[PDB]
Structures are given as structure tokens and as C-alpha cells.
Amino acid sequence: SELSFNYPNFQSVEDITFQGGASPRNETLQLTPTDSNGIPIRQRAGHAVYSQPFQLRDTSFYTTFTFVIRTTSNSPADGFAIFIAPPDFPVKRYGGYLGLFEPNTATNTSANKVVAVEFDTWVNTEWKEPRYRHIGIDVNSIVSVRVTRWQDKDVFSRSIATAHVGYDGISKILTAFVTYPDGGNYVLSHVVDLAEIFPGDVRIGFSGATGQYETQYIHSWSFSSTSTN
Ligand SMILES: *[C@H]1O[C@H](CO)[C@H](O)[C@H](O)[C@H]1NC(C)=O
Ligand SMILES: [Ca+2]
Ligand SMILES: [Ca+2]
């Protein structure tokens, strides 16, 4: 179906739903909470989602957002993701599950219905993932189907980074491009039939989790979808 929105900043959150530890703060979406002293709270997850459902049958979309990772040590955890899931998808487990999975089914593709582009700051030993910080495409599992190295210089840059995520509904391909000002660029794509996974309605949004020593912020976001028919 056709949907468009545009948030150059979050002075308005009219159409954004916050769940778990996420909240609007300083004209941003703050995905995980901080205490009254500004310190990241450990072991929390949060979602900030566009409230209106849409359909993926015969649909292409383009979305872009800007983001900042604020770290308070060289060992931040856990990261954040942009995700698509059914409209009643709740905030799930904190830590390396990124708010998107739970321990007993996190690697079981038959037990999940969620697609995401993750920005992963903490190398988990509890399931397979690369030995370095990474950006990945996840299809129904916390073990990414496509994953690439995310350079530490960019992770810790303090920059406002940009992501572009697109889905071509004819070729059935999800793509992310991530760019840093005067830093790295990242390209990842995967063939996945989203309408097969999600025959009904979905929402798109962000999930963040701690972890420790990290807060994730979304500074702007826009989206457009169009019919392929
Ligand atoms: C365990 O804690 C670290 C931080 O010390 C990370 O948050 C990691 O993801 C956690 N493990 C799991 C399985 O969530
Ligand atoms: Ca990962
Ligand atoms: Ca991880």
C-alpha cells in the first residue's frame, strides 16, 4: 500500500508510538533510557514505531534516517535496528536480542516474523556473529543472513550518520546504504520476499537495546511506499 511521512526532526511525534524504554527527547527518538544523571540504564530495550500499519503486497519502499550512537566507554552494547513486523509486535528482550527476539527462539527462523537492518555494537558469544562490530540484515533470526564489518572509527565517531533502506517489490530485494560524513560507506543487500513473510499488515520502526554505556538516537526519518502493480 501507499504511505508517506517525513520527520525532519521530532518536535512532533504525532504518529510515533513509544514502547518499552524508548522516549522522545531533545527533538530525537531516544531508543533506550537514561537515568536522572544521564547515564545509560543497563538491560533495557525500547521501540519507536510509525503508528499506522501498511501492507507489503505489490509494494516498494524507500526510507532514510539519521542517527547518533552516544557511547560512554570503549565497550558499548548493544546497538539498534530498523525493523518491520506485525502491528502488535511488542518490545522483546534487552541485550544482544536488540529488543527483537527472546532467548529461547532467537535463532529459530520458524518461530519469528521480523525483518531488520541492525547496527550491532557488541560481539555476542551466545550465537554466531562476526568477531567485529557489524551492520546486518536479519530475517527471522538474530543471526544475520547478510553481515558486514562496521568500522570502529565510524561507530565511535560521534557523527550524525545516514541510512537509506529500500525494498524493491518486483525483484524482492532489501538494501541498506549507510554513510558517515568524512567516514565509511556500507552496502548490504539480500533477496527476501517480504510479502510472503508478511501477508497482512505491518509497521516499521526502530528498536534499541542495552547493554551498557550506550544510547541510540534517531534525529530524522522519512518514508515513502508505492505500488508495483
Ligand atoms: C550480556 O551483556 C553484554 C554487556 O555486558 C551485552 O549486553 C550482551 O549482549 C549480553 N548478552 C546477551 C545474550 O544479551
Ligand atoms: Ca549481530
Ligand atoms: Ca550483538
Identify each DSSP E strand in the chain by its residue range.
Answer: 4-7, 16-20, 23-25, 28-30, 45-50, 54-55, 59-71, 77-85, 115-120, 134-139, 146-149, 161-168, 173-179, 185-191, 201-212, 214-227
Q: Is 196 annotated as a binding residue?
A: no
d(CA 74, ligand 1 centre) in Å: 15
The CA distance from 158 to 97, in Å, is 24
For 1-229, the fitting CATH number among 3.40.1280.10, 2.60.120.200, 3.40.50.10680, 2.70.98.40 is 2.60.120.200
The verdict on the CB of residue 211 being under 6 Å from ligand 1 is yes
d(CA 76, ligand 2 centre) in Å: 14
Q: Which secondary structure element, helix H or strand E, spans residue 196, and what is its range?
A: helix 194-197
The CA distance from 57 to 180, in Å, is 33
